Amino acid sequence: KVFGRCELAAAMKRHGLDNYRGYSLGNWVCAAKFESNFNTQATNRNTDGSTDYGILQINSRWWCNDGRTPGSRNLCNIPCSALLSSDITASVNCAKKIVSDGNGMNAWVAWRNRCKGTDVQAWIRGCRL
């Protein structure tokens, strides 16, 4: 599924992402835009064997198990395929764990280069929340 900026902003808010660990809603919407362009089906192959799955491009080397990544750690205890679902519940719960257990939202280079320190309010403006 491809979400519209506002449709996604509302879903994430219902899932407790607004100001989760200090990151206002816009950061999460802005991340998703540049990571997957709001497509829950996005998959990206990397040089080390792993793949990024879903709306927040979560990696198979550390977070989920796709049965084809060497040294997989599966820290979210989830088959990577659950992250390709239309229901963003699984991608969110794992994203909350990656953001808790580490470097904040630095796990996402697109967020670091395109969202950090910008007016992230632009991502939720015009939306009915």
Side-chain angles (χ1 to χ4, degrees), residues 43-104:
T43 61
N44 153 278
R45 263 232 229 107
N46 302 116
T47 63
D48 77 323
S50 63
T51 301
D52 304 311
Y53 298 78
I55 198 138
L56 258 3
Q57 297 286 275
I58 302 186
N59 198 261
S60 70
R61 169 63 223 288
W62 306 115
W63 310 103
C64 57
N65 179 57
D66 64 347
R68 56 160 206 181
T69 308
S72 183
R73 293 259 263 275
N74 192 358
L75 267 358
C76 283
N77 189 214
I78 209 78
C80 296
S81 56
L83 305 175
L84 296 184
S85 170
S86 279
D87 191 351
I88 64 155
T89 297
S91 302
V92 175
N93 291 328
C94 183
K96 281 176 170 165
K97 293 169 179 181
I98 293 156
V99 65
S100 296
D101 304 324
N103 225 334

Side-chain angles (χ1 to χ4, degrees), residues 2-3 92 110 117:
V2 183
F3 281 94
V92 175

